[PDB]
Design a protein around this ligand. Structure first.
Ligand SMILES: [Cu+2]
Length: 6
């Protein structure tokens, strides 16, 4: 994740 894409 909510506060963390790959
Ligand atoms: Cu994320």
């Amino acid at each position: 994740x909510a506060s963390x894409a790959a």
